Each structure stands twice: as C-alpha cells, then as structure tokens.
C-alpha cells in the first residue's frame, strides 16, 4: 500500500496517473475518485488561465488602465461598477462565445467527455508552439502552465482579500495609518458573547 508523495501519511491517490502533478499526487479529499478527473483537469486549467489573466488585469487596472473615455477607480474591485456597461456586455458576450464554440456545444459535466474525449484542457489554441520538444519538454511546458495557474489562483485570491482588508488600492500595501487588519465587521455568536452584546 503506497502513499502519496505530497502527503506521505495518506494513501496514494489512484486515478491520478501522469498528467502534471504525477510526482506529487495531491488529492486528500479524493475528488478524482469521486468525479471524472478529466473534468477536474479541465476546470483546474480554466481556473488557472482565467486567474493568470485576472492577476494581470487586476494589477494593471490602477496604473495602465483608463481606456480612452472610461472612468478610473483606484480599488480594482470597484472597476466592475466603474466601467461602461457596453464594454462589459461585449466582453461577457465574447467569453460566452469562446466557451460555447470551443466545446462544440457539449458544455456540460455529463456531456463534456462523452463522445469527443479529446484531451483534458486542450483547445487547439496555440498548439503550433508546442510538440516541438519531442513529448518530453512538452510535458514540462504543461507542468509550467499548471504551476503558474495554481500560483495565479492563490495570488488573485490574495489580491482580492488584500483590497478588501485595506479598502483602497492594491500596491500601496500596508498603507499609512493602517495599523493592522481588523475590518471584518460582521457579528457572530462568539462575537456576540465575547463583546457582551447579548446578556446583562
């Protein structure tokens, strides 16, 4: 009974053959044993790519944003509201078109891989710059894509929550007079009993 390389105190996750993290098989909960892991790979790749683009845009907006005629909020979270509804509508339209056409209308966890079991996360976009590495460094390129995607996902999460704890821009990290985060102003039962809101 082998153990996973990543978490050595847990059994090695089966159904996680070599895709990217075959050297550090990491599935403690076991979604790969519960779900079609090809769909899981597709979701992870789409999340990683969307988050790479999201980190780049989130960083860029406060400084080199400002499309001619669009208004500029310093807090990049507020940029959704302080943007033209027309540009946002066209952008969502383009995203939906790309999502629908790429999978030939089989955009569904049941129907995603039912007849066109092409490859997990492959869309034929820019494949001309791949496969010249003799299927050995192409796997390394896929590994780099996955690592950058996961790092970008965690980074975008951190950027969003930093902008929330600061309630301002992003890059003025630890702004003047910030003196630490205590901004979560939502009451809680433990908060109610601790702060003596109830009782007495």
């Amino acid at each position: 009974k082998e153990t996973s390389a990543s978490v050595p105190f847990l059994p090695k996750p089966k159904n996680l053959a070599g895709w990217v993290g075959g050297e550090t098989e990491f599935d403690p909960i076991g979604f790969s044993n519960w779900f079609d892991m090809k769909w899981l790979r597709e979701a992870e790749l789409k999340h990683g790519r969307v988050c790479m683009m999201a980190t780049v845009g989130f960083v860029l907006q406060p400084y080199i944003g400002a499309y001619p005629g669009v208004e500029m909020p310093a807090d990049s979270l507020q940029a959704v509201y302080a943007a033209p509804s027309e540009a946002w509508f066209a952008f969502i339209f383009a995203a939906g078109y790309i999502e629908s056409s790429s999978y030939n209308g089989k955009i569904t966890q049941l129907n995603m891989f039912e007849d066109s079991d092409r490859v997990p996360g492959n869309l034929g976009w820019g494949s001309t710059r791949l496969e010249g590495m003799s299927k050995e460094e192409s796997e390394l390129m896929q590994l780099k894509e996955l690592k950058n995607g996961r790092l970008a996902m965690l980074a975008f999460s951190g950027m969003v929550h930093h902008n929330i704890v600061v309630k301002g821009a992003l890059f003025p990290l630890v702004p003047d007079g910030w003196t630490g985060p205590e901004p979560w102003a939502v009451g809680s039962i433990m908060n109610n009993x601790x702060x003596x809101x109830x009782x007495x």
């Binding site: 779900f35 209308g105 569904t108 966890q109 049941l110 129907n111 702060x195 003596x196 809101x197 109830x198």
Partner: protein
Amino acid sequence: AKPLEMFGGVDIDLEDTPAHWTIKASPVLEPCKDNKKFHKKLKDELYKVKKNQQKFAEGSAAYARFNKKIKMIELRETAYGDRLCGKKDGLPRTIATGEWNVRGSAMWPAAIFLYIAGWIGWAGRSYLIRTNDAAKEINIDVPLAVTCMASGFSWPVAAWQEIVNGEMAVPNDQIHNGGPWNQS
C-alpha cells in the same frame, strides 16, 4: 366633464398616445420621493424606532443596534425614492407589465427564478433518467446527483433541443392514459 365624479372617484387617462403605455405615466401612481404618504409612513417608522431607542441606556449595545436599525430605515427610505407608489397609500408598487427598465419591475426576478427553477427541474429529471431504479432514489448516488446538479446550468438549450428532437415528450400510447370509461 370631470371623469372623477362621473365614475365614482376613479379617473381615466382620456388620451391615446403610446407614451402613456408605460406604468410611470399612470395617474394612480407617483414617484415615492415626492409622495406625502411615503414621507409620513417612513417618518413614523423612524419616530417609532427612535422612541424605542431612547427607552434604553445610552452606552448599551441595544442603543448601537437601534442606531444600525435607524440607518437601515433611512437607507430604505432613500433607496425606494425612485420606486413608484400610489398617490394615496405611499407604499411602493411592483411593476408587472414587462417594462424591464423600471424600479421594482418583476421581469428581472421572473427571469432569474425561471432560470434557476428550470435548472432544478432539469437536474432532477436528468438524475431520474440516469437512475432508472427505486434503490437509487432512497440511497442517492451522490456523485451522479451532484454531476447532474452541475450539468443543469445548460437547461434552456438542452431542454429545447430535446423538445424539438423528440426526446422530452412521450406519445400518449406509451403511458397509462387513465381509468377506462367504456367497454361493454
């Protein structure tokens, strides 16, 4: 000749123009931010809540919670200002004419609910079709159940594609029509 008295109080538009087809042109209604009954009702709400607030200590937590309630009430007053309310009640109205572009319109909630309700029904139907057994209805196949639940998002297209391709309905000669009404 004063249609108000002719019809026992109710008033008629008496004008045939397309510009009056909107709900905002109705003489029964009026924007809430300039309606006397709206002002009086929300002022009475503020007065009652404030009178309750003074009954407690100044530095207590109840005082702070009542301040938060007062802020919520004032935010509600300023938020419903653009909503239409009747010229006699002051209570804002919900628009059910398919306007799509008025405060308090019922088109957006209708669209959202219809989408999510079709999603729920489609997920349930997909699970029932893919589990053609009674054992799978008492002991839910949770992976398949959540797979169908996630797959239900494309219901407005998949359902129509099944309707036109003869995969949703079934001919009446394949299900029990009902009790016999004749034979002799």
